Amino acid sequence: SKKVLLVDDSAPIRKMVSFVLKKEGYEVIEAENGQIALEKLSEFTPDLIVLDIMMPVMDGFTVLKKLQEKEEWKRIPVIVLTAKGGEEDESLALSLGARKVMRKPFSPSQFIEEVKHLLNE
Amino acid sequence: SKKVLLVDDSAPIRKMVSFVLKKEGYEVIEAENGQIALEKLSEFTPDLIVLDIMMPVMDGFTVLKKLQEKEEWKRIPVIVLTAKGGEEDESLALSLGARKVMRKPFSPSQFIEEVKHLLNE
Amino acid sequence: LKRIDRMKTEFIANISHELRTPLTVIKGYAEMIYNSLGELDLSTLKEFLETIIEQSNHLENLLNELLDFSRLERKSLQINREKVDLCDLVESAVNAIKEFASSHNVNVLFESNVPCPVEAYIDPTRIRQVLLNLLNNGVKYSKKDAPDKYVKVILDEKDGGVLIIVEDNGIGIPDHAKDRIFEQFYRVDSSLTYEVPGTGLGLAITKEIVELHGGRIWVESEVGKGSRFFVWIPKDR
Amino acid sequence: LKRIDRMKTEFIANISHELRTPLTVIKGYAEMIYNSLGELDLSTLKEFLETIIEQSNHLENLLNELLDFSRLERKSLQINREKVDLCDLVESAVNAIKEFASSHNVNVLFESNVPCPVEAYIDPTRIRQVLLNLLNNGVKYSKKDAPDKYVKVILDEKDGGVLIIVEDNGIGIPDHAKDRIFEQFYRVDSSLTYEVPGTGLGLAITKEIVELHGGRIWVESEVGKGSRFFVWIPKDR
Numbered sequence A, B: 001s002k003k004v005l006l007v008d009d010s011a012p013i014r015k016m017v018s019f020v021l022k023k024e025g026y027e028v029i030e031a032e033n034g035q036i037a038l039e040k041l042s043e044f045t046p047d048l049i050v051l052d053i054m055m056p057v058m059d060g061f062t063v064l065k066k067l068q069e070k071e072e073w074k075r076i077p078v079i080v081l082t083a084k085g086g087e088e089d090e091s092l093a094l095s096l097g098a099r100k101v102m103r104k105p106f107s108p109s110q111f112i113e114e115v116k117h118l119l120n121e
Numbered sequence C, D: 001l002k003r004i005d006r007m008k009t010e011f012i013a014n015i016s017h018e019l020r021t022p023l024t025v026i027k028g029y030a031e032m033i034y035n036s037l038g039e040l041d042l043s044t045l046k047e048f049l050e051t052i053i054e055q056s057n058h059l060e061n062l063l064n065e066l067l068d069f070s071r072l073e074r075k076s077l078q079i080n081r082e083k084v085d086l087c088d089l090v091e092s093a094v095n096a097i098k099e100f101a102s103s104h105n106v107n108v109l110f111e112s113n114v115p116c117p118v119e120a121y122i123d124p125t126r127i128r129q130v131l132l133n134l135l136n137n138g139v140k141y142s143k144k145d146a147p148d149k150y151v152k153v154i155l156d157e158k159d160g161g162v163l164i165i166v167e168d169n170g171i172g173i174p175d176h177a178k179d180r181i182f183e184q185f186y187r188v189d190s191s192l193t194y195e196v197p198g199t200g201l202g203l204a205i206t207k208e209i210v211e212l213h214g215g216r217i218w219v220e221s222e223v224g225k226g227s228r229f230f231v232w233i234p235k236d237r
């Protein structure tokens, strides 16, 4: 069982995403904003980060950037899962080390496929 | 089994409303706009009219008004089922002889309760 | 263009109206299932979940259209051209509007004045979106009592490019609106008074798409009778 | 107030963003069920349908807020006053924001300077909506690294009426925005650059509600440190 850091400000999304992830046997750690996320990263390293962009306190891009400037953090795979349409936003996230970008709303199955692909690399 | 004239321009709504109505044993006749509706009224009298407001070709208020100016039509009970929020719109519909006004989205059960109340009067 | 602010505020209400149409279906079927758990078989339940998924897709699209609007106002939308056969492009568009036009007993017709392998260097998705918008308006704004309601696509090539006409015997368009109907959020007073579903975005989006191809779109119509929309797209370089 | 048109167009995109949050949940769980028909028991299915119904209710509400906006701009919203105890009204509002404030580790506090059976002749639903809006903004705009993030409701009565203060050690508000934050669609640049969820409607709605009671709302804050929102409502006639 791998460990996943779920970062998003919507509880319903967290609860939903957690269900799909735990269905595949994974352990889930939830963070509701960018700062919460970074606090949890300082005292453990997850196998994957599912990351939202638009959040209070600290946004996803700030997180992405702060992940890069640390050695132990910049190798952790990140799926950006955002309600933002843009091709500029996808491109920026990728250039900040995000592996995949997925637009909300999304298919929970295709999400699961993409999670497994990154955990088996 | 009573007969109901379902007037609405959204097929998904018609298909949904038809299912709830037919579940209670009623016969359903569908109309997709105000004119279609009036054509079907000329060659049969239903026990109830479920009426939408915003439609192409002919709106619900026009229908309501054209129902009033005929003797055989102005006694048919009408539920207005509309996506329009207003208290002016509810009041207008009532003054044009509409019995109930229900805002979309709605509870299919409460709808069914209201349909039965008007068919047993 | 001052009065534009008065239009944007009537649009907010229109956005709620059309967004809460698929929402009605979603919350509907969902309550149907949540209540009739015993009565329902696990194969009509499938039929029911399908339509929830499809209807939440429809309102995803209605939101997408709002983005693509502000993607043109903010001026960043890329046009991906290629050589397409317009004959089968408009046929696909005519076939996409089938069920909608049937409902209100509107006849959809496609006619080509020039032999049919008509090719042009255009964005296949964006031009279709223009066709659909015009075709839809054709159905949406048809006459109350006109024996046979029709929408007609006439495809021809002349005048340094390709010329597409969308004809309808519909409610027509007044003189003062002949230009303003392409403005963002603009709907003719009639659409408002007679409670016609709409946003005022369709044509504004359409116009910007046509002109990004370096083409032009105008309308020739008379208030009582018939409306014809002209779409011209240049061919050579 | 020319630049208002530039605000309304940034709002279209913001509307799609917050509407597609509950839509994600709806299409999500619905696909979860449609696929895992065998695996799922008919009692977690209930739990799943519930949240679909509740989430489609949340986006019904987000649309309702858009209507109530254009109900104030069009100027027709009725205010239904009655004698309410503000102490338990704000307590209800503090209790409504519990889970949201918990998430981002924001402390919600209510303090009354005057003994607590404080009554006033006000719309119980509309004032709550004002409280919730301010309280929410308190949580929404909290500092990145401030040891203890708090929002404080101070209830007092003086100066010919009742005075409500909503305090927060948050990101503060610059001078030029101290007035403009109550305009429709206005968000401070920071909210845009740091990708904070929002519409720009909350306070515009709030202000109109307060002033329909014949009251006033202003803000005293400094950019680094703390923001205090003042709501004054008159008592006698």
Ligand SMILES: Nc1ncnc2c1ncn2[C@@H]1O[C@H](COP(=O)(O)OP(=O)(O)O)[C@@H](O)[C@H]1O
Residues within 6 Å of the ligand: C133, C137, C138, C140, C141, C168, C170, C171, C172, C173, C181, C182, C186, C187, C188, C189, C191, C197, C198, C199, C200, C201, C202, C203, C204, C227
């Ligand atoms: N075929 C037509 N016949 C009559 N009026 C039309 C037609 N097409 C468009 N209009 C008018 O032009 C306005 C703008 O069209 P459009 O941008 O598609 O907005 P809408 O979403 O309201 O259809 C419409 O509201 C309608 O009043």
Ligand SMILES: Nc1ncnc2c1ncn2[C@@H]1O[C@H](COP(=O)(O)OP(=O)(O)O)[C@@H](O)[C@H]1O
Residues within 6 Å of the ligand: D133, D137, D138, D140, D141, D168, D170, D171, D172, D173, D181, D182, D186, D187, D188, D189, D191, D197, D198, D199, D200, D201, D202, D203, D204, D227
């Ligand atoms: N407590 C606060 N601290 C800092 N900025 C605030 C606060 N409350 C409101 N603002 C600013 O004022 C703007 C308007 O507030 P509001 O009408 O609630 O819009 P929004 O939906 O963006 O919160 C916000 O976008 C934000 O920039």
Ligand SMILES: [Mg+2]
Residues within 6 Å of the ligand: A008, A009, A010, A052, A053, A054, A055, D197
């Ligand atoms: Mg978010």
Ligand SMILES: [Mg+2]
Residues within 6 Å of the ligand: B008, B009, B010, B052, B053, B054, B055, C197
């Ligand atoms: Mg309708």
Ligand SMILES: [Mg+2]
Residues within 6 Å of the ligand: C133, C136, C137, C198, C199, C202, C203
């Ligand atoms: Mg249109």
Ligand SMILES: [Mg+2]
Residues within 6 Å of the ligand: D133, D136, D137, D198, D199, D202, D203
């Ligand atoms: Mg707000």
